[PDB]
Structure formats: structure tokens, C-alpha cells
Amino acid sequence: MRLEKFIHLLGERGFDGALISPGTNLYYLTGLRLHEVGERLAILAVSAEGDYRFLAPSLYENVVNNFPATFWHDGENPYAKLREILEELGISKGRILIEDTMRADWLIGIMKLGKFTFQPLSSLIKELRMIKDKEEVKMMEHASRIADKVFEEILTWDLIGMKERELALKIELLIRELSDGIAFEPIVASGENAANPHHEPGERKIRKGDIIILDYGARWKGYCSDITRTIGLGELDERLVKIYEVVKDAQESAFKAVREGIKAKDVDSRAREVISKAGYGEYFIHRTGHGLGLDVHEEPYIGPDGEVILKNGMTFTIEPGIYVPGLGGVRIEDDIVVDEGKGRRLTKAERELIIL
């Protein structure tokens, strides 16, 4: 049904076709999934008329099921074969949508097969992927359920002495155990390192007294979860305990505001104001949230620049944070789904400050 909706939407927006290399969008529209495609040209070509063909390396004739295809064997010019395909479908010229993540070398090669006008596929597909259907929500529900479970397990561990990279690897192995895989490289940021929202787990040793930001996500049948919890080891510096309660308040506040009809930026503003009123406005160095589904980061964005009007089915995160250089940081993130016109938490893990 999706591929057909996409096709109708293609015409409604004036595009003649689309070229979609493997990845989340391809999967979304067809269920097709190729293992490590790398350099080998693999492309779903779609016409606004209704026809479509998937060009792929002979090596994938098994995974493609019976999806209309045309294979190319090594020694052949994938680009020439694509050109023929573009002709049969009648799109060897015109405005063509291009998968956002496709390799530049493939696009360069595609540029020689005809005279086209290009635009990123996301500019149009986001309209469909932003509103999750019932099954997609169920899948995200389980991914979030697993993220909750992983958190519970982490708390039974003895963190002291562990190095960030080490804790992150344990989290990662657990996620790979409980799910289809990590949604992204887990992030463990301890002590003063928690002050960097984009910290990359390293050699720092976790010690008593350290605040720790735990950020990770699982994947279930392709759908992602993305959670973040901040815990403390022993007694935390008093300045960080105060900060925590503030972020907690901001996150719950932003969540309650979630309603069908409000702009994404208003949700961000609702968490933003709580943090400003407490005097930490300058330390909240990022958007309040981002959407998720087949990817960790997708529409709609929950920042001061989010223009999307929330609607039932949309899924995104709420994770305001406060980062103080030389001291640390705190972030509390939940995956939220707009349901029955109201915000509903997909992740249930403990929100109160936990001191191991």
C-alpha cells in the first residue's frame, strides 16, 4: 500500500520518478533488505505512472523475493542496465527524487544517464514515514520495552572501575542479545564528560561520586527506540542533584504539552522555559527532541525551528538537557507517540534520580 501511496504522492507533487538505493526508505516502501551492498549499484526505480523495477547485483536474486527485478552480473555496466530500465519506465529525463543516503559516486554515474533535476527523497517520503501505522507503533513499543529492560539490567551491575568504553560495550552486547541490534553506538559519558552532549565513550574510569549519562537504543524488526537516563554513583555533587530535578521537570512538562494540533516548536518551548526559569538556559545546548522510526533521527524535529503540527501517529523523543562544563550534565529522554490526541510514553523506565 505504501509504494502505491508514494507513487500517488509523486504525481501530486510533480515528480516524474525516483531512484532509491538500499536503506530505510527502500525497506519502508517494499520490505527489501540487502546485506552489505557497498559499491554494487542496487536501485529501485519508480515512475509517477505506476511502474517500477529494482535493479540489483545477481548476488541478491535470493533476498529480492519476487519483487519486479532485473539483475546485473559482474562484468556488466550497472549504469547502462539502469539506463535501459529508465527508458522502459519513461523516466530517462525529468524531475527525479533521489534517496538521501545514496553514494555520491552512484549519483555522479546516474547523472550521465539522462538530463534530470534532483531533489532528496526525504523531502517527500517524510510525509508518509512521520505518521506510524498500528504495526509500526507496536514494533516501536517493543523496541522501547527492550530499552527499558536494558536499563534495569545495567542497574544490577557494579560500574565502579569500569571505563566508559567498557560500560558502553556491555550495554551494546546486551542490546544485541535482547534485540535485532543497537540503533546506534551506545554512549556512556561520566563525570565532567557528561558536560558534552556529543561525548564519545573513552578511557575515563567511572568513580564513586560520578554522574553518568546513559544513551542507547535498540532495534526491533527495523524500528528504533532511543532512551537516555542519568544515574549517580554514591552521593552526587549537590549542584548536579539540583540540575537533575530541573531537567526532570522540563521533560515531564514538555511531555504533558504534547497534543494533536500544537507545533513541534511549542513542545520544545515548554521544556525550554522550565530550564530558563531556573537560570540554566545557556547550558541547554540542543533541540528538545527528534522523531524516530526506521531511523534514530527523522521527522518531526522538536526544536525552536520545528514547524510540524503534531498529529496522531507521529513518534519522537523528548530529551531536554543541562550541560555545565567542568561539572557534568543531565538528560532524560523518552520516546513518545501521539495517541488519541495526547502524548503517550513508549519508554517506562524510572525517571527519578537513581543513586547506586
How is residue 138 written as a grid cell?
A: 507496536
**Cβ nearer to a second copy, comparing 133 with 177:** 177
**Cβ nearer to a second copy, comparing 1 with 104:** 104
User: In the Cβ-directed half-sphere of 345, how many Cα atoms lie within 13 Å?
Assistant: 20
- Count other C-beta atoms under 10 Å from residue 253's C-beta: 18
Stretch (H or E) spanning 147: helix 134-154
Q: Given candidates 53, 132, 272, 287, which one binds a second copy under the rule CB under 8 A?
A: 287
Q: Is 27 in the site for a second copy (CB under 8 A)?
A: no
The residues in 308-347 that bind a second copy, with binding defined as CB under 8 A, are: none
Site string for Co ion, 226-245 (x = CB under 5 A): x-x-----------------
Q: Is 215 in the site for Co ion (CB under 5 A)?
A: yes
Q: Is 164 in the site for Co ion (CB under 5 A)?
A: no
Secondary structure class of 213 (helix, strand, coil): strand
Name the segment binding Co ion (CB under 5 A); options: 112-120, 196-204, 218-226, 259-267.
Answer: 218-226
The rounded radius of gyration (Å) of the Cα atoms in the chain is: 23
Choose among Co ion, a second copy, none what residue 297 binds, the Cβ cut-off being 5 to 8 Å by kind. Answer: a second copy
Closest CA relative to residue 59, chosen from 72, 77, 68: 72
Smallest gap from residue 329 Cβ to a second copy (A): 14
Smallest gap from residue 346 Cβ to Co ion (A): 13
Choose among a second copy, Co ion, none what residue 350 binds, the Cβ cut-off being 5 to 8 Å by kind. Answer: none
Task: Classify the C-alpha dihedral 168-173-176-179 as positive or negative.
Answer: negative
Q: Given candidates 93, 95, 286, 342, which one binds a second copy under the rule CB under 8 A?
A: 286
Q: Given candidates 120, 170, 221, 356, which one binds a second copy under the rule CB under 8 A?
A: 120
Cell 525497506 belongs to residue: 27
Q: How far apart are CA 322 and CA 75, in angstroms?
A: 56
Name the segment binding a second copy (CB under 8 A); options: 96-104, 135-143, 210-218, 336-344.
Answer: 96-104
How is residue 256 written as a grid cell?
A: 504533558
Q: How far apart are CA 57 and CA 42, in angstroms?
A: 7
Farthest-apart Cα atoms in the chain, separation: 69
Smallest gap from residue 328 Cβ to Co ion (A): 17
Q: How far apart are CA 274 and CA 194, in angstroms?
A: 21
Q: Is 106 in the site for a second copy (CB under 8 A)?
A: yes
By the criterion CB under 5 A, which residues form the site for Co ion?
215, 226, 228, 333
